Amino acid sequence: PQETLNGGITDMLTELANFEKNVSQAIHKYNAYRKAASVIAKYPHKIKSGAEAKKLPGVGTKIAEKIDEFLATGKLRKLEKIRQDDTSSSINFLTRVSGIGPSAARKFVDEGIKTLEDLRKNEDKLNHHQRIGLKYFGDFEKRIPREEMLQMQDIVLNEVKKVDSEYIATVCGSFRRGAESSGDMDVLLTHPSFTSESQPKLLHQVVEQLQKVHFITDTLSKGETKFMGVCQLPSKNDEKEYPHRRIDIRLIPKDQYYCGVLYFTGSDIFAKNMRAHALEKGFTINEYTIRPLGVTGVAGEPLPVDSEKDIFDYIQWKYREPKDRSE
DNA sequence: CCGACATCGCATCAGC
DNA sequence: GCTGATGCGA
DNA sequence: GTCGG
Numbered sequence A: 001p002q003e004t005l006n007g008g009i010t011d012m013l014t015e016l017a018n019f020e021k022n023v024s025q026a027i028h029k030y031n032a033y034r035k036a037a038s039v040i041a042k043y044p045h046k047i048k049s050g051a052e053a054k055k056l057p058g059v060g061t062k063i064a065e066k067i068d069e070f071l072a073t074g075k076l077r078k079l080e081k082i083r084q085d086d087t088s089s090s091i092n093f094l095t096r097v098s099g100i101g102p103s104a105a106r107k108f109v110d111e112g113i114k115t116l117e118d119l120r121k122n123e124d125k126l127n128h129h130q131r132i133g134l135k136y137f138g139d140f141e142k143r144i145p146r147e148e149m150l151q152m153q154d155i156v157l158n159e160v161k162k163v164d165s166e167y168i169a170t171v172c173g174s175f176r177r178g179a180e181s182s183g184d185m186d187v188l189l190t191h192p193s194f195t196s197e198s199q200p201k202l203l204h205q206v207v208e209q210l211q212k213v214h215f216i217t218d219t220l221s222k223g224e225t226k227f228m229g230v231c232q233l234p235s236k237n238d239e240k241e242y243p244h245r246r247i248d249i250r251l252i253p254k255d256q257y258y259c260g261v262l263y264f265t266g267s268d269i270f271a272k273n274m275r276a277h278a279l280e281k282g283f284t285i286n287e288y289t290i291r292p293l294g295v296t297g298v299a300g301e302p303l304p305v306d307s308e309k310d311i312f313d314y315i316q317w318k319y320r321e322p323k324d325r326s327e
Numbered sequence B: 001c002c003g004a005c006a007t008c009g010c011a012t013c014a015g016c
Numbered sequence C: 001g002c003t004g005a006t007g008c009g010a
Numbered sequence D: 001g002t003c004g005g
């Protein structure tokens, strides 16, 4: 359903969601406002009344009243006032710097740091992550066209195989689902010599090669299974510079790899469907394993998985291509 | 009435 | 110094 | 904030 259908309401709702998360630190109300925004964004009718909205799962009494106020007046008094509040609106904004969450934003605004200029004057008060996110504030909100993602996949798959031809790397995320643009790049990495029961240099070596061919330009965090960093395509001769992009690489054991691929392919809207669909068959699936429930409820040992397809066979579900997986 | 509401790796903090 | 708690992104 | 035990 198009935006102009209920876009007024979902924008209200997402705005209320962010103020809950970033200012009031009410994460559950943040998820509430998003559950309603999402169920409403899919509702294929221009909502005429808050009561009409309340029929949808996740829209309850208090949101329904906000939809009334918005429909009568075109605005929400509480949101207008908060949008004009210097403190709250500053707190809310600085959380757009990756590395600054609600807690650090509030503490910056407490001491009167309120803008990117204020963050630039006070670099010594930022951690490493925050400086990188500050450095790339703009770049990080630009989206990645599939053409650039493909070029990025070319570099990643090539340099991984060049380190060790026995690595398997899959670029997951929306990209894997045909998405015409992406928000970041999500790489899963596995290797024969890495299993549930079993060097720590396996991930570090892949990061090192991508840093050495100047693909990876900064490191947000790094450990033995999860990498969070920044990358950029080489510049096309005299032509312009690409944006720096968010890239994550994570190392998964061989026998947990396809559970990971499915998990980190998403969408979450599809993913939680398929673990509750799916719970009926007496199976539970986290990112790692699939296991059987369980006649009072005891999960058994994890069942072998050798393809993304297998986890569809256990559930007696039709295999779904990544491309048909937005829900 | 009143609690659940994804879950996890990693960086940094509080506390010992 | 080490462990555990907390913030953070996703 | 919403849902539901």
Ligand SMILES: Nc1nc2c(ncn2[C@H]2C[C@H](O)[C@@H](COP(=O)(O)NP(=O)(O)OP(=O)(O)O)O2)c(=O)[nH]1
Pocket: A172, A173, A174, A175, A179, A181, A182, A183, A184, A185, A186, A263, A264, A265, A266, A267, A268, A271, B006, C010
């Ligand atoms: N949002 C979210 N996704 C999760 C989570 N846990 C696992 N996933 C899964 C579901 C996600 O689909 C998958 C990829 O991670 P992203 O980069 O966060 N989402 P995508 O790449 O699809 O969209 P975009 O192009 O804008 O980056 O990981 C979680 O806690 N939150």
Ligand SMILES: [Mg+2]
Pocket: A172, A173, A174, A175, A182, A183, A184, A185, A186
């Ligand atoms: Mg992605």
Ligand code: NA
Pocket: A054, A055, A056, A057, A058, A059, A060
């Ligand atoms: Na309802």
Ligand code: NA
Pocket: A094, A095, A096, A097, A098, A099, A100, A101
């Ligand atoms: Na942030």
